[PDB]
From TrEMBL, chains A, B, C, D, E:
SMART domains: SCPU (SM00972). Residues 6-156 form the Spore coat protein U/FanG domain. Keywords: Signal. InterPro entries: Spore_coat_component, Spore_coat_U/FanG. Disulfide bonds join C18-C62. Pfam families: SCPU. This is Spore coat protein U/FanG domain-containing protein. It comes from the Bacteria.
Amino acid sequence: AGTLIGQVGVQMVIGAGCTIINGSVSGGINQWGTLDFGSHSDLTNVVDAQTVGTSGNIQIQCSTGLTPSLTVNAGLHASGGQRYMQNTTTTSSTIAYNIYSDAARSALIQANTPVDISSVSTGTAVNIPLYGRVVPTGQSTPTPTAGTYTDTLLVTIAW
Amino acid sequence: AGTLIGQVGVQMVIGAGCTIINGSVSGGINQWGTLDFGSHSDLTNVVDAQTVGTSGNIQIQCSTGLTPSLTVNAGLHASGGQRYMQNTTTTSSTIAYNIYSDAARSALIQANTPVDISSVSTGTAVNIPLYGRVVPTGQSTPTPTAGTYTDTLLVTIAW
Amino acid sequence: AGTLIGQVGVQMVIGAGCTIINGSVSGGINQWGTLDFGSHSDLTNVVDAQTVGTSGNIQIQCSTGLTPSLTVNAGLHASGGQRYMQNTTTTSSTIAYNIYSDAARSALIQANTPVDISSVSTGTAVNIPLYGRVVPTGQSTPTPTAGTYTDTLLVTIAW
Amino acid sequence: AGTLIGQVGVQMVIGAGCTIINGSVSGGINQWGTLDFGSHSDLTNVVDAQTVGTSGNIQIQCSTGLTPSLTVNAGLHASGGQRYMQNTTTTSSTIAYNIYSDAARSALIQANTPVDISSVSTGTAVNIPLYGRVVPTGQSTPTPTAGTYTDTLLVTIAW
Amino acid sequence: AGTLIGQVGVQMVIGAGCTIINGSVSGGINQWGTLDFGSHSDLTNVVDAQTVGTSGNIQIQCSTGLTPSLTVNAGLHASGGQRYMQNTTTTSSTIAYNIYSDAARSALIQANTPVDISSVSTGTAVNIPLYGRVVPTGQSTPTPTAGTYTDTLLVTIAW
């Protein structure tokens, strides 16, 4: 009863880069390592960790200029704007954690808020600005149960 | 030595619609936007893009009922049933890409094969079901040369 | 008061043909199909159609040699040399349309102007050179009212 | 053995005319043109023709008043009151045809039946009311053989 | 101075007939109808007429056997052996005409030359063998003036 004809056209340009390195892809998921905090018990001291994946650390290796933006989604298990970790065995146990955009862990990254990380330019393959820290305050009870707590984020680089 | 007389008669009906919106026409070509993947270098991560044209995204705004059919022709530079992109400067460089009929990019669109996209009905001006993805597997060498790769399709809506 | 006697004589020759096929005749009208554009609403994209009648497409199947001439009369509802379509319900609504003598729709057919379509010779039953196109420019208001717009032509083949 | 004497007396009057024009005479036959239908093959569409002879069309140019009568004899090859055409090579092949007294071809002329064509008066040299049409119904088989079919009539004008 | 005496004797026999019918007599003139050609203007087509008088056509109704002879005198206005017609108003205008002894108008009747019309025998009241035809060749100028052209013959039947 009708018919419309049109052409779309597809264009892609190779040039200015700023693409992540040392990140494996399985099925288009585009995984970018893991924030491995390590093994501890009865957390009463601050623990620091950085995004490490398989062989080598995740790096940026951005292009000259091109001030980018980093956006980190809240975790699957979130409440009150603070990302959480939930055990795979017991649903009640939970550990809170924070994430920072600098090595000194002074600038906090908020959920769904872009961060102007413009210092990763000029190549040089600098480490990705994503550092986590667990502080033993407000961590429900100081001593949690046993398990393997896990959580996943969603990191977006726009430029 | 001869003469034949006859009348043809031309009929057009306005009513049930299901016509594309936000698509400019120049000379009867009836262009429908562009699949702009963006700028990258040394493609090693999956890149997603959607059909965007000038001011606003391409939409359908189909009519009630009228289960339509979407057919996408293979590109000008094709081999083995997979659409390709070819540089305007160097003929050797090529990047493969795929196209999907859903946002999740789970249903693949084959060349010259109709797709029963019946969920775009009831108006509401839903986005056109045409999404592309570039996966860094089988992309000849992982790092291509520089240029502005281009390709054009031929989208047909029958209903 | 007077009387004159004379003989006229009637002659018809069967031989060189070049006669239309797939065209029904009712009462000597000698109908030759219909230019069915289809169903649309708020025409903003170019629509193409070809002369189709009942079971099969209208064809020529002309004879060897015999360079013919195609003449298309202006429609019943015409103004300024451009053929129009008028609704059967509301007299004000009108859609303009054009007609072409080739598949590419590059050569326009003017009213009461013969066209030397000499490429339809050597039999082979080629499709009749009559293609229509509706372009959404100068179409009064872009969105018309509802109805079943109709128009009739008068196609003459002389050779 | 006998002898009778008498005078006959011959009278002719010049005045009111209504005499045919553009008609050559050879030996008193008083020919009045030809109904040339043209060249066709596999007649499936209606063909129209008018009485044309040598340089110009046959005309009447009748006198004021003087309501005349037109009588057309049946052809040499006739059967069932319908005039026929017979090939000069094969006797079996035959095409039927009709004749009309008006341009619209709505009033049929019957064999040996006068027609009151009173509208050809007031001079003005109007075209002779004799039009033929071949309709592809009841034409034996739709496709005839090759040849030059011919037939002759006998037109009488009485007034 | 003298005187002679003698008897003549008058004899008439009734029997074998072959006498004309449908012919009025006024004063011994013994008129036999009229060759009424009719009314025409600008004679360019052959005109035929037969000897008709008052109520009915002139007939012979001859007797059995008795091969008769028909002799037709030249007209009052004759020149070169061809009978002519002269207007009663203008003496210059003239139309030539011929006369024939058969219906087909193939056998010409010459002035003062007997014709052996032996086929009118056996009664049956056959039409008189006298037919006239006007041919538009050598008729001075093709278009004559107005008037009522007349001429009289002298028909003799000897047997």
